Short mmCIF file of C-alpha atoms and ligand atoms in Angstrom, two decimals:
data_model
loop_
_atom_site.label_atom_id
_atom_site.label_comp_id
_atom_site.label_asym_id
_atom_site.label_seq_id
_atom_site.Cartn_x
_atom_site.Cartn_y
_atom_site.Cartn_z
CA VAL O 1 118.61 100.15 63.39
CA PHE O 2 116.48 101.32 66.29
CA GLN O 3 113.47 103.63 65.79
CA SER O 4 112.16 103.98 69.44
CA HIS O 5 114.04 103.98 72.81
CA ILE O 6 112.20 103.00 75.99
CA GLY O 7 113.72 103.94 79.34
CA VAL O 8 112.81 101.54 82.19
CA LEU O 9 113.36 102.56 85.81
CA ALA O 10 113.36 99.86 88.52
CA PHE O 11 112.75 100.09 92.24
CA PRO O 12 115.88 98.30 93.53
CA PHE O 13 114.39 96.64 96.67
CA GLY O 14 112.21 93.60 97.45
CA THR O 15 110.97 91.53 94.47
CA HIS O 16 110.39 94.63 92.33
CA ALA O 17 113.26 94.66 89.76
CA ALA O 18 112.91 91.01 88.57
CA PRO O 19 109.22 91.16 87.49
CA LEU O 20 109.88 94.46 85.70
CA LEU O 21 112.91 93.00 83.85
CA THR O 22 110.73 90.05 82.81
CA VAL O 23 108.23 92.49 81.20
CA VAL O 24 111.15 94.33 79.47
CA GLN O 25 112.44 91.02 78.09
CA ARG O 26 108.94 90.11 76.84
CA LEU O 27 108.58 93.52 75.14
CA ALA O 28 112.17 93.38 73.69
CA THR O 29 111.50 89.91 72.18
CA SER O 30 108.52 91.37 70.23
CA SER O 31 110.10 94.77 69.47
CA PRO O 32 113.21 94.36 67.32
CA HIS O 33 113.31 98.04 66.10
CA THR O 34 112.98 99.27 69.73
CA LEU O 35 115.85 99.76 72.16
CA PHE O 36 115.26 99.29 75.91
CA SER O 37 117.51 100.85 78.53
CA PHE O 38 117.07 99.36 82.03
CA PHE O 39 118.11 101.54 84.99
CA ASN O 40 118.59 99.96 88.42
CA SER O 41 121.07 99.86 91.30
CA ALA O 42 124.38 98.07 90.60
CA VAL O 43 123.65 95.79 93.64
CA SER O 44 120.21 94.78 92.22
CA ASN O 45 121.61 94.35 88.65
CA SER O 46 124.29 91.94 89.92
CA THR O 47 121.43 89.59 91.16
CA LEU O 48 119.45 89.75 87.78
CA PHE O 49 122.20 89.43 85.06
CA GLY O 50 122.38 82.60 78.90
CA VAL O 51 121.22 82.52 75.22
CA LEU O 52 117.57 83.50 75.88
CA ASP O 53 118.66 86.51 78.14
CA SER O 54 121.35 88.16 75.83
CA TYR O 55 119.18 90.72 73.93
CA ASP O 56 120.56 92.92 71.16
CA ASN O 57 118.03 95.57 72.18
CA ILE O 58 118.43 95.74 76.02
CA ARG O 59 121.12 97.96 77.59
CA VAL O 60 121.73 97.87 81.38
CA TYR O 61 122.63 100.93 83.45
CA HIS O 62 123.37 101.53 87.11
CA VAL O 63 121.99 104.49 89.01
CA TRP O 64 123.28 105.85 92.26
CA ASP O 65 121.43 104.19 95.13
CA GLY O 66 121.97 107.32 97.34
CA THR O 67 124.39 105.60 99.84
CA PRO O 68 127.62 107.54 100.77
CA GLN O 69 130.91 106.44 99.06
CA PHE O 70 125.85 98.26 102.85
CA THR O 71 126.82 99.00 106.55
CA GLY O 72 123.31 100.43 107.42
CA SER O 73 119.91 98.59 107.30
CA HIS O 74 117.61 97.66 104.29
CA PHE O 75 115.24 100.37 105.73
CA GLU O 76 118.06 102.99 105.73
CA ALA O 77 119.05 102.09 102.13
CA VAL O 78 115.47 102.59 100.84
CA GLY O 79 115.39 106.16 102.38
CA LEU O 80 118.78 107.16 100.90
CA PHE O 81 117.66 105.82 97.47
CA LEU O 82 114.49 107.90 97.54
CA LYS O 83 116.43 111.02 98.78
CA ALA O 84 118.79 110.76 95.70
CA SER O 85 115.74 110.45 93.32
CA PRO O 86 114.96 111.58 90.68
CA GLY O 87 118.32 113.26 89.80
CA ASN O 88 120.09 109.86 90.05
CA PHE O 89 117.92 108.51 87.19
CA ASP O 90 117.78 111.78 85.23
CA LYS O 91 121.56 111.90 84.90
CA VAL O 92 121.74 108.30 83.65
CA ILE O 93 118.88 108.72 81.20
CA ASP O 94 120.90 111.47 79.58
CA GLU O 95 123.88 109.07 79.24
CA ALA O 96 121.74 106.39 77.62
CA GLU O 97 120.37 108.91 75.11
CA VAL O 98 123.93 110.12 74.25
CA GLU O 99 125.39 106.57 74.03
CA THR O 100 122.57 105.29 71.80
CA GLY O 101 121.99 108.44 69.75
CA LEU O 102 118.20 108.08 70.50
CA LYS O 103 116.24 110.29 72.87
CA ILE O 104 113.83 108.30 75.04
CA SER O 105 110.37 108.01 73.45
CA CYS O 106 108.61 106.45 76.44
CA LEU O 107 109.41 105.94 80.15
CA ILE O 108 108.27 102.80 82.00
CA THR O 109 108.84 102.78 85.75
CA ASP O 110 107.94 100.78 88.75
CA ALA O 111 104.67 102.35 89.96
CA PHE O 112 106.39 103.21 93.27
CA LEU O 113 108.60 105.69 91.34
CA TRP O 114 105.97 108.45 91.22
CA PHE O 115 108.64 110.82 89.94
CA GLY O 116 108.59 108.81 86.69
CA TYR O 117 105.61 111.01 85.86
CA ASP O 118 107.73 114.19 86.35
CA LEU O 119 110.69 112.79 84.31
CA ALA O 120 108.33 111.74 81.47
CA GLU O 121 106.42 115.04 81.53
CA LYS O 122 109.71 117.08 81.40
CA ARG O 123 110.94 114.98 78.43
CA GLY O 124 107.54 115.05 76.67
CA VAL O 125 107.05 111.23 76.63
CA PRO O 126 104.40 108.88 77.95
CA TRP O 127 104.77 107.43 81.45
CA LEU O 128 103.84 103.78 81.88
CA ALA O 129 103.69 102.46 85.44
CA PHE O 130 104.37 98.80 86.30
CA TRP O 131 102.53 97.71 89.46
CA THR O 132 104.28 94.70 91.03
CA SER O 133 101.24 93.22 92.92
CA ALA O 134 97.65 92.20 92.05
CA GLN O 135 94.69 94.44 91.14
CA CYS O 136 93.21 94.09 94.65
CA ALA O 137 96.29 95.74 96.31
CA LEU O 138 96.39 98.56 93.72
CA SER O 139 92.65 99.24 94.23
CA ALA O 140 93.16 99.48 98.02
CA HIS O 141 95.87 102.10 97.49
CA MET O 142 93.83 104.02 94.86
CA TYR O 143 90.98 104.50 97.40
CA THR O 144 93.41 105.96 100.02
CA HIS O 145 91.99 109.53 99.72
CA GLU O 146 88.34 108.33 100.03
CA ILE O 147 89.18 105.96 102.93
CA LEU O 148 91.00 108.67 104.94
CA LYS O 149 88.29 111.26 104.11
CA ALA O 150 85.57 108.83 105.42
CA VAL O 151 87.23 107.61 108.68
CA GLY O 152 90.47 109.60 109.26
CA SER O 153 93.80 107.96 110.22
CA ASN O 154 93.44 107.26 114.01
CA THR O 155 81.35 100.97 112.74
CA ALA O 156 84.01 101.91 110.05
CA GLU O 157 85.46 98.33 110.35
CA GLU O 158 83.29 96.02 108.13
CA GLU O 159 81.02 98.93 106.86
CA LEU O 160 83.22 101.43 104.90
CA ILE O 161 85.08 99.08 102.52
CA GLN O 162 81.90 97.16 101.52
CA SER O 163 80.21 100.56 100.69
CA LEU O 164 83.26 102.06 98.89
CA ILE O 165 85.54 99.62 97.00
CA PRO O 166 84.05 97.49 94.18
CA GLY O 167 85.25 93.86 94.49
CA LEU O 168 86.78 94.33 98.01
CA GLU O 169 83.54 93.90 100.05
CA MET O 170 85.10 90.81 101.79
CA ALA O 171 88.13 92.92 103.02
CA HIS O 172 88.33 94.59 106.43
CA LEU O 173 90.07 98.00 106.99
CA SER O 174 92.71 95.96 108.97
CA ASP O 175 93.45 93.83 105.82
CA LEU O 176 94.46 96.86 103.77
CA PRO O 177 98.11 97.79 103.19
CA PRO O 178 99.05 99.62 106.37
CA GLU O 179 100.84 102.52 104.46
CA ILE O 180 97.24 103.77 103.63
CA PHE O 181 96.96 104.91 107.32
CA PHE O 182 100.61 106.12 107.92
CA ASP O 183 100.18 109.97 107.48
CA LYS O 184 101.92 111.13 110.82
CA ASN O 185 105.65 111.82 110.02
CA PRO O 186 105.43 109.13 107.36
CA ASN O 187 108.64 107.25 106.54
CA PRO O 188 110.11 107.69 103.06
CA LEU O 189 108.43 104.55 101.60
CA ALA O 190 104.95 105.59 102.90
CA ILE O 191 105.54 109.08 101.35
CA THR O 192 106.55 107.47 98.03
CA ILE O 193 103.49 105.15 97.88
CA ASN O 194 101.07 108.03 98.68
CA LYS O 195 102.69 110.22 95.92
CA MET O 196 102.31 107.23 93.55
CA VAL O 197 98.55 107.24 94.19
CA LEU O 198 98.35 110.95 93.31
CA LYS O 199 100.34 110.50 90.06
CA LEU O 200 99.02 107.15 88.68
CA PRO O 201 95.88 108.76 87.08
CA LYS O 202 98.32 110.68 84.78
CA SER O 203 99.93 107.46 83.58
CA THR O 204 99.45 106.60 79.91
CA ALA O 205 99.16 102.93 81.04
CA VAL O 206 99.25 100.94 84.25
CA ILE O 207 100.73 97.45 83.62
CA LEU O 208 100.28 94.40 86.02
CA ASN O 209 101.72 90.87 86.11
CA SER O 210 98.15 89.61 86.78
CA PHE O 211 95.16 88.51 84.74
CA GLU O 212 91.83 90.30 84.55
CA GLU O 213 89.79 87.22 85.42
CA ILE O 214 91.25 86.83 88.95
CA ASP O 215 89.06 89.84 89.92
CA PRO O 216 86.77 90.97 87.11
CA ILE O 217 84.93 93.64 89.17
CA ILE O 218 88.20 95.20 90.47
CA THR O 219 89.59 95.14 86.93
CA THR O 220 86.49 96.92 85.54
CA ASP O 221 86.73 99.54 88.35
CA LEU O 222 90.43 100.22 87.71
CA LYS O 223 89.78 100.44 83.94
CA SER O 224 87.48 103.41 84.86
CA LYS O 225 90.30 105.15 86.89
CA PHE O 226 93.19 104.76 84.38
CA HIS O 227 93.77 105.63 80.72
CA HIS O 228 94.91 102.05 80.06
CA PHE O 229 94.81 99.31 82.67
CA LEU O 230 96.76 96.35 81.24
CA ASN O 231 96.93 92.99 82.97
CA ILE O 232 99.57 91.13 80.90
CA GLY O 233 100.33 88.11 83.07
CA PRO O 234 101.07 85.68 84.39
CA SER O 235 104.54 86.25 82.81
CA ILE O 236 105.59 82.70 83.87
CA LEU O 237 102.85 81.27 81.57
CA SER O 238 103.20 83.76 78.68
CA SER O 239 106.99 83.35 78.58
CA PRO O 240 108.27 80.05 80.03
CA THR O 241 111.94 79.35 80.84
CA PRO O 242 113.54 76.13 79.50
CA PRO O 243 114.15 73.58 82.28
CA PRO O 244 117.81 73.90 83.40
CA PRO O 245 119.65 70.64 82.57
CA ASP O 246 120.23 70.17 86.38
CA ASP O 247 118.95 71.27 89.85
CA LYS O 248 121.98 71.59 92.18
CA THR O 249 119.55 72.01 95.20
CA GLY O 250 118.43 68.33 95.06
CA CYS O 251 114.78 69.43 95.49
CA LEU O 252 113.42 68.06 92.17
CA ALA O 253 115.22 64.66 92.56
CA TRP O 254 113.65 64.46 96.06
CA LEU O 255 110.15 65.31 94.73
CA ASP O 256 110.68 62.68 91.95
CA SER O 257 111.09 60.02 94.76
CA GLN O 258 107.59 60.78 96.13
CA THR O 259 105.04 58.02 95.40
CA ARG O 260 101.78 59.91 96.01
CA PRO O 261 100.56 62.80 93.79
CA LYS O 262 99.57 65.99 95.61
CA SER O 263 100.99 64.68 98.95
CA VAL O 264 103.88 67.11 99.66
CA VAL O 265 103.54 70.23 101.82
CA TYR O 266 105.80 72.93 100.32
CA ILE O 267 106.71 75.66 102.86
CA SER O 268 108.29 79.02 102.06
CA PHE O 269 107.96 82.47 103.69
CA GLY O 270 109.81 84.32 100.89
CA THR O 271 113.39 85.61 100.66
CA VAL O 272 113.35 87.79 103.86
CA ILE O 273 110.89 86.71 106.62
CA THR O 274 111.59 83.92 109.04
CA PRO O 275 108.72 83.17 111.42
CA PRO O 276 109.73 83.20 115.04
CA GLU O 277 111.55 80.04 116.23
CA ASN O 278 108.58 79.02 118.52
CA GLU O 279 106.24 79.13 115.43
CA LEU O 280 108.82 77.09 113.44
CA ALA O 281 108.79 74.64 116.33
CA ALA O 282 104.95 74.45 116.31
CA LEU O 283 104.99 73.86 112.56
CA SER O 284 107.71 71.12 112.94
CA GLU O 285 105.41 69.37 115.48
CA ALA O 286 102.42 69.57 113.11
CA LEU O 287 104.53 68.07 110.26
CA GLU O 288 105.71 65.16 112.42
CA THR O 289 102.12 64.56 113.65
CA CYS O 290 100.42 64.71 110.19
CA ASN O 291 103.18 62.61 108.46
CA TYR O 292 102.72 64.49 105.11
CA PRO O 293 106.06 64.63 103.29
CA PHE O 294 107.37 68.19 103.19
CA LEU O 295 109.84 70.38 101.35
CA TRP O 296 110.74 73.50 103.37
CA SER O 297 112.72 76.54 102.20
CA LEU O 298 114.30 77.70 105.49
CA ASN O 299 117.70 79.33 106.16
CA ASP O 300 120.39 77.10 107.75
CA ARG O 301 120.47 79.14 111.04
CA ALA O 302 116.73 78.80 111.61
CA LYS O 303 117.02 75.05 110.66
CA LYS O 304 119.82 74.54 113.28
CA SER O 305 117.46 76.00 115.95
CA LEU O 306 114.55 73.58 115.24
CA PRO O 307 113.64 71.16 118.09
CA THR O 308 116.20 68.51 119.16
CA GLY O 309 115.94 65.37 117.02
CA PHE O 310 113.22 66.84 114.69
CA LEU O 311 115.79 66.85 111.76
CA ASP O 312 116.99 63.28 112.57
CA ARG O 313 113.43 61.87 113.00
CA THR O 314 112.15 63.49 109.73
CA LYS O 315 115.24 62.68 107.58
CA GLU O 316 113.08 60.21 105.56
CA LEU O 317 109.86 62.35 105.58
CA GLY O 318 110.99 65.91 104.70
CA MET O 319 113.71 67.92 103.01
CA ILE O 320 114.83 71.34 104.30
CA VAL O 321 116.93 73.56 101.99
CA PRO O 322 118.05 77.20 102.29
CA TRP O 323 116.60 77.90 98.79
CA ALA O 324 114.19 76.03 96.47
CA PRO O 325 113.58 76.48 92.73
CA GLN O 326 110.06 77.45 93.79
CA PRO O 327 108.25 77.61 90.40
CA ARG O 328 109.72 74.18 89.42
CA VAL O 329 108.69 72.79 92.84
CA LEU O 330 105.11 74.07 92.59
CA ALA O 331 104.84 72.55 89.04
CA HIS O 332 105.77 69.08 90.43
CA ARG O 333 102.97 66.50 90.46
CA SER O 334 103.85 65.49 94.06
CA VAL O 335 103.06 68.95 95.60
CA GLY O 336 99.66 69.19 97.32
CA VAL O 337 99.71 72.47 99.26
CA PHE O 338 101.84 75.58 99.72
CA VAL O 339 102.29 77.19 103.18
CA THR O 340 103.04 80.79 102.14
CA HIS O 341 103.65 84.30 103.47
CA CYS O 342 101.18 85.45 100.71
CA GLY O 343 103.59 87.44 98.57
CA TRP O 344 101.98 88.06 95.18
CA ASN O 345 104.65 86.28 93.09
CA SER O 346 104.34 83.19 95.32
CA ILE O 347 100.50 83.21 95.05
CA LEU O 348 100.65 83.65 91.29
CA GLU O 349 103.19 80.82 90.94
CA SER O 350 100.84 78.64 93.00
CA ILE O 351 97.81 79.50 90.80
CA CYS O 352 99.86 78.73 87.69
CA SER O 353 100.48 75.17 89.02
CA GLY O 354 97.07 74.57 90.63
CA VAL O 355 98.44 74.32 94.17
CA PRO O 356 96.14 75.46 97.00
CA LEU O 357 97.49 77.69 99.79
CA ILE O 358 97.74 77.85 103.56
CA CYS O 359 98.27 81.56 104.38
CA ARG O 360 100.61 82.95 107.13
CA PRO O 361 100.91 86.63 106.15
CA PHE O 362 103.19 89.03 108.03
CA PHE O 363 102.83 92.79 108.58
CA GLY O 364 103.17 95.21 105.75
CA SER O 365 102.61 95.46 102.04
CA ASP O 366 99.70 93.50 100.56
CA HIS O 367 100.32 90.12 102.32
CA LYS O 368 97.32 90.29 104.69
CA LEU O 369 95.01 91.49 101.89
CA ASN O 370 96.28 88.69 99.60
CA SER O 371 95.50 86.20 102.45
CA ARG O 372 91.95 87.57 102.69
CA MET O 373 91.41 87.22 98.94
CA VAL O 374 92.89 83.67 98.99
CA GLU O 375 90.35 82.51 101.65
CA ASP O 376 87.25 84.67 100.97
CA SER O 377 87.27 85.80 97.31
CA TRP O 378 89.51 83.58 95.13
CA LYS O 379 88.78 80.65 97.58
CA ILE O 380 92.07 78.93 96.62
CA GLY O 381 93.23 78.35 100.20
CA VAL O 382 92.75 78.94 103.90
CA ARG O 383 94.10 81.19 106.64
CA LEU O 384 95.21 79.94 110.07
CA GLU O 385 93.54 80.16 113.47
CA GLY O 386 95.07 83.20 115.20
CA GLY O 387 97.08 84.06 112.01
CA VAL O 388 100.02 81.92 113.32
CA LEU O 389 101.51 78.44 112.71
CA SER O 390 100.46 76.99 116.08
CA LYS O 391 100.46 73.17 116.08
CA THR O 392 96.60 72.98 116.38
CA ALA O 393 96.12 75.77 113.72
CA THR O 394 98.55 74.00 111.32
CA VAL O 395 97.03 70.49 111.79
CA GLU O 396 93.56 72.10 111.20
CA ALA O 397 94.59 73.96 108.00
CA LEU O 398 96.32 70.85 106.57
CA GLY O 399 93.15 68.84 107.28
CA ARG O 400 90.89 71.48 105.66
CA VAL O 401 93.01 71.56 102.42
CA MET O 402 94.22 67.91 102.25
CA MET O 403 91.27 65.83 103.53
CA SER O 404 87.94 67.69 103.73
CA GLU O 405 84.99 68.38 101.42
CA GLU O 406 85.99 72.08 101.77
CA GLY O 407 89.41 70.96 100.43
CA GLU O 408 87.85 69.38 97.28
CA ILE O 409 86.04 72.73 96.57
CA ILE O 410 89.32 74.67 97.09
CA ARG O 411 91.15 72.35 94.67
CA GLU O 412 88.39 72.74 91.97
CA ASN O 413 88.65 76.56 92.51
CA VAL O 414 92.47 76.65 92.12
CA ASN O 415 92.26 74.33 89.04
CA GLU O 416 89.63 76.65 87.48
CA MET O 417 91.77 79.72 88.29
CA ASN O 418 94.81 77.96 86.69
CA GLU O 419 92.67 77.40 83.56
CA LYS O 420 91.63 81.10 83.45
CA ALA O 421 95.30 82.17 83.78
CA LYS O 422 96.29 79.90 80.89
CA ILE O 423 93.41 81.16 78.70
CA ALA O 424 94.36 84.76 79.51
CA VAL O 425 97.89 84.43 78.00
CA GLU O 426 96.86 82.32 74.96
CA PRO O 427 95.73 83.97 71.72
CA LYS O 428 92.46 85.92 72.12
CA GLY O 429 93.00 85.89 75.93
CA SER O 430 92.70 89.08 78.02
CA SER O 431 96.45 89.22 78.84
CA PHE O 432 97.42 88.35 75.23
CA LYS O 433 95.29 91.24 73.93
CA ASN O 434 96.53 93.64 76.66
CA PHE O 435 100.15 92.79 75.85
CA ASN O 436 99.48 93.57 72.14
CA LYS O 437 97.98 96.91 73.27
CA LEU O 438 101.15 97.58 75.29
CA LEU O 439 103.31 96.84 72.20
CA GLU O 440 101.19 99.36 70.19
CA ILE O 441 101.80 102.02 72.90
CA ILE O 442 105.58 101.53 73.10
CA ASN O 443 106.42 100.90 69.42
CA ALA O 444 104.11 103.85 68.35
CA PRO O 445 103.09 104.04 64.62
CA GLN O 446 105.68 101.23 63.92
O1 UPG N 501 113.29 79.31 98.29
C1 UPG N 501 112.67 80.16 97.65
C2 UPG N 501 111.83 81.20 98.18
C3 UPG N 501 111.28 82.10 97.33
N1 UPG N 501 111.51 82.10 95.97
C4 UPG N 501 110.91 83.12 95.09
O2 UPG N 501 110.93 84.38 95.75
C5 UPG N 501 109.84 85.18 95.26
C6 UPG N 501 109.13 85.79 96.45
O3 UPG N 501 108.25 86.80 95.93
P1 UPG N 501 106.85 87.10 96.59
O4 UPG N 501 106.10 85.88 96.83
O5 UPG N 501 106.12 88.15 95.74
O6 UPG N 501 107.19 87.67 98.04
P2 UPG N 501 107.54 89.17 98.55
O7 UPG N 501 108.76 89.61 97.80
O8 UPG N 501 107.56 89.12 100.02
O9 UPG N 501 106.29 90.05 97.92
C7 UPG N 501 105.77 91.33 98.29
O10 UPG N 501 106.68 92.39 97.96
C8 UPG N 501 106.97 92.47 96.52
C9 UPG N 501 107.99 93.57 96.37
O11 UPG N 501 109.12 93.30 97.19
C10 UPG N 501 105.67 92.74 95.74
O12 UPG N 501 105.92 92.78 94.34
C11 UPG N 501 104.69 91.65 96.08
O13 UPG N 501 103.41 91.86 95.48
C12 UPG N 501 104.46 91.64 97.55
O14 UPG N 501 103.36 90.74 97.72
C13 UPG N 501 108.98 84.29 94.35
O15 UPG N 501 109.16 84.52 92.96
C14 UPG N 501 109.45 82.88 94.72
O16 UPG N 501 109.43 81.94 93.65
C15 UPG N 501 112.33 81.14 95.41
O17 UPG N 501 112.55 81.03 94.22
N2 UPG N 501 112.86 80.25 96.29
#
């Protein structure tokens, strides 16, 4: 017998849908008189959907992704999806209400889906926005109007941000998400993100898979901008997953064979980016030179293009796989450092295991800002000389993290940040309390 019905609208691209589903599952676990309907593309849903994931109170729906009836590009697909919005979702929300017999009482959406505000307003329900990155990235976007008003789109560098954005004084204009400055015939995603900024102050709550204590001053600032600003993470600590009885990748058996704690260099650039094959070569040379053991998530093509005899010579030193069980890898006692593209989920996984970072961010999104925070605010890792994996830059970064006095300070900082994350999700912790507040908002008087 359900009393409340929460509609949840995902953004079906990048690493957006999974973190939102995780929050839905956490809320569903605690909300047995509340029904949750999750709306996403059929293609995304087929990647996301065992005993702990079969909820009596979660229904899954597909919405039209806007493609004709993929042959075109990821870029193309995102534009068609946004062109079909919000009518694609509106039609399916009706179906969920008819099938369940319960009108929606609340709408949670990815924060990118600005039109969640319009759908919630039309239905006379609260809109809750789930931001899929850290507070620092959200703050950068929220100051878009003030940034553009101060310096325009086309002295400002290292003066404006330190005067304007609480807690981002260490960031440069060139660290900020580039979509802030894309206002000439903006692409559909830039349009969507700038409409998000305009709507978010009319959210009933903004929800983050972060913890307040990673950036107290930014958190306090954003609490002043939003009705409710609710850091509820890290989800991976609040809500662990039982260890799978096996690991078909071989990674964990290989890490178990390592004889030195904190010795292994784990390398991943995410699900999409591959560095250019001359940068992969430079990294391969640094690994052979430094003789740290390594575990590298790299696609089989890129691997086949590494330098002649590198794979044969390093057979007994490193393991290269097309996919790693990354959270399980980072939790392994043998891992000493993570060479990352500075995606938020990767950084947060690293914090949650006390693994320091070597940062190689690529263009777009919040990766460059995250790299700045890692080196100059959080102080849980280092960036590279020239922002590339040159052999000299890579040997230098590995030395700074693995065998310097600066390295010992970085490891105390990442251990302290791990402790703050754990405290946040335990009873009386900031994230624990914020998640109870979120339950009060969604489940209403009861
Ligand atoms: O072999 C691998 C490689 C990656 N991962 C996982 O893949 C995810 C990668 O996510 P993330 O580190 O956040 O990278 P991006 O998806 O590039 O992240 C950017 O884009 C996301 C939306 O697409 C935003 O939510 C992020 O904040 C933003 O930083 C993580 O959970 C990793 O554990 C694996 O499990 N195995």
